[PDB]
């Protein structure tokens, strides 16, 4: 892979962020949000495919926290084809109960550089 590290981080943020639509649909339907190949009963799977930039396999690349209170976290870790200077960093795309979302990056590796974070998902 020849993409820039910052392009990889941004793509990953976009891949997680693309799932907000589905999370909003689950919330309107009164269903628990999941990312699973085996959603149980009333659970609503958010339709994620797979990324070349995230650790884990398929739907398990996105870790969902659904507190059932209008807040949501969609969490992924940079891995696989990601450059060594970003691997292990965690993207968290979070919803407040007013329906406003935000993004942050945490747990970055030593070799992280400021310019790798996009303006829409700052390092915390």
Author numbering: 25 to 148
What did the published study say regarding this structure?
The type IV pilus is a diverse molecular machine capable of conferring a variety of functions and is produced by a wide range of bacterial species. The T4P is a filamentous polymer made of type IV pilins, the individual protein monomer (PilA), that is polymerized by several chaperones and minor pilins to form fibers that can extend micrometres in length with an outer diameter of ∼5–8 nm. The general architecture of the type IV pilin protein is an extended N-terminal α-helix connected by an α–β loop to a four- to seven-stranded β-sheet, termed the head domain, which packs onto one half of the α-helix. The C-terminal globular head domain faces the exterior of the assembled pilus, and in P. aeruginosa pilin proteins it features a conserved disulfide-bonded loop region that is responsible for cellular and surface adhesion termed the D-region.
